[PDB]
């Protein structure tokens, strides 16, 4: 299979404005939201039909309780960081946990935290350590590293549990996640500012979002600057992107094991 990932995010906001919740937690399988929880709904809900159809009420019932607990723990952790930093007003606290199952069968695992959207603590499952970005993070790291059982638990979660959940969700969403929708690629030539010809290579209607696009002069990569367009969601479950140059040129597209050449 291709590279797939499972990730869960937590967002905590102290003193939030009207509307905005105090806590949001959302899960993703690749680019696909799979689950959601916030401090307003107070319920874990599916964000994909294949999640809703395959996971029994007891999964959602149990996880809602865990999230109600995690919500509370986040509110307290943010109050302690603000105390530490001597910060008043509204501030954010974030977490990202997750794992990847690579094509070759190997795995990656990660657990990170941010304060005000900047890196705070990064977990090293290989040395059972926390990388602190500053003196406040260092106080947390010292506290966190004292429980060796918690560190070991986390290494097992990232390596074994996370991978098992990913494989499980990959099967549920098989028809969405494992499908391939090839791109429709066109080349557009234009004489822009007098004497300046811009060649655009536009790709659309593709799934998965990972595509590789490049320009070539005679069969060697254009040492001139290539302007790359972002991979954008089209809104129908497919993605779009582009790549441009200024001037024998050819556009090269590689998507899901198929290479495509568009000569000019």
């Amino acid at each position: 299979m291709r590279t797939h990932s499972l990730r869960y995010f937590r967002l905590g906001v102290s003193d939030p404005i009207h509307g905005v919740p105090e806590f949001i937690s959302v899960g993703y399988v690749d680019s696909h939201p799979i689950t959601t929880y916030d401090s307003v709904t107070r319920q874990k809900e599916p964000r994909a039909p294949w999640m809703a159809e395959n996971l029994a009420p007891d999964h959602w019932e149990r996880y809602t309780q865990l999230l109600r607990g995690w919500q509370q723990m986040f509110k307290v952790e943010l109050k302690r960081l603000q105390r530490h930093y001597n910060h008043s007003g509204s501030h954010t606290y974030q977490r990202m946990i997750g794992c990847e199952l690579l094509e070759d069968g190997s795995t990656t695992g990660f657990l990170q935290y941010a304060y005000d959207g900047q890196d705070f603590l990064i977990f090293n499952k290989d040395t059972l350590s926390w990388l602190a970005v500053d003196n406040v993070a260092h106080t947390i790291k010292q506290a966190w590293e004292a429980n060796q059982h918690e560190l070991l638990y986390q290494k097992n979660w990232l390596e074994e549990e996370c991978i098992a959940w990913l494989k499980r969700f990959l099967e549920y969403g098989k028809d969405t996640l494992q499908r391939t929708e090839p791109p429709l690629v066109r080349v557009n030539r234009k004489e822009t500012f007098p004497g300046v010809t811009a060649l655009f290579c536009k790709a659309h209607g593709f799934y998965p979002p990972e595509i590789y696009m490049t320009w070539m002069k005679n069969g060697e990569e254009i040492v001139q600057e290539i302007d790359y367009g972002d991979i954008l969601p089209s809104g129908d479950g497919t993605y779009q992107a582009w790549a441009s140059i200024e001037l024998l040129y050819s556009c090269h597209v590689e998507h899901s094991g198929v290479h495509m050449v568009l000569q000019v």
Epitope: R62, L66, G69, Q72, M73, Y153, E161, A164
Partner: antibody, heavy 108, light 112 residues
Framework: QNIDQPTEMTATEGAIVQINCTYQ??????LFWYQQHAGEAPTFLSY??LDGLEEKGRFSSFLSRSKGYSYLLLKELQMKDSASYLC??????????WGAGTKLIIKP | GVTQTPKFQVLKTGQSMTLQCAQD?????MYWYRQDPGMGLRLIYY???????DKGEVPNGYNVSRLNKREFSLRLESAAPSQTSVYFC????????????FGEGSRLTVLE
């Protein structure tokens, strides 16, 4: 789903006893061992989540995640070690599955 | 640690009964179990955090109150002889496998 440990075990004072525990859980977040003396509350003994043997005095706990088993080893047995030993395993949903216990009898 | 009351109690079938539990360890999660012969601890109800509770394996004939962060009561609506058991209250710091701390236990006997 299922945690299995012997109902009872009898060993001789001064000797070693290994209380086995096999788990068949839907996911795994760690294995616990608790000691419960007759008519008393259970108290935490050990926790294992990764493969290996963890020693805490005369007591040691081992885990084999591939083999799906654990053991609680008691060395230099004393009459005081006569209690029920409770095995508990945690689910992929952070739920504890409690074993029925093992009554350990020490023959003086 | 965990403080539960009473250690012993005799009840006539149909009587109401409240079991109190308090922890002063700043633990978040709290549990009510029943210990019966030949079986592992059966969870009645749990409270993952202050402000939430949920049913366990055996919730019928029981209800609970997470009064505050410290306290977790267990009520027997109408005592039945099947409810003759030993009840344990437990508390955990977190939910991710922090060790459980047990109350002294409460032996309840329900008689016609």
């Amino acid at each position: 789903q299922n945690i299995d440990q012997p109902t009872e075990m009898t060993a001789t004072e001064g000797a070693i006893v290994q209380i086995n525990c096999t788990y068949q859980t839907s996911g795994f977040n760690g294995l616990f061992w608790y000691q419960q003396h007759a008519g008393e509350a259970p108290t935490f003994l050990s926790y294992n989540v990764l493969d290996g043997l963890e020693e805490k005095g005369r007591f040691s706990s081992f885990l084999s995640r591939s083999k799906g088993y654990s053991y609680l080893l008691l060395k230099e047995l004393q009459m005081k070690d006569s209690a029920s030993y409770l095995c508990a395993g945690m689910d992929s949903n952070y739920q504890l599955i409690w074993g029925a216990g093992t009554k350990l009898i020490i023959k003086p | 640690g965990v403080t539960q009351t009473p250690k012993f109690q005799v009840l006539k079938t149909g009587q109401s009964m409240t079991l109190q539990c308090a922890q002063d360890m700043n633990h978040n999660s709290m549990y009510w179990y029943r210990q019966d012969p030949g079986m592992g601890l059966r969870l009645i109800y749990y409270s993952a955090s202050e402000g939430t509770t949920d049913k366990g394996e055996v919730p019928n004939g029981y209800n609970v109150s997470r009064l505050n962060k410290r306290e977790f009561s267990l009520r027997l609506e109408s005592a039945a002889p099947s409810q003759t058991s030993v009840y344990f209250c437990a508390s955990t710091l977190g939910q991710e496998g922090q060790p459980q701390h047990f109350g002294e236990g409460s032996r309840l006997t329900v008689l016609e």
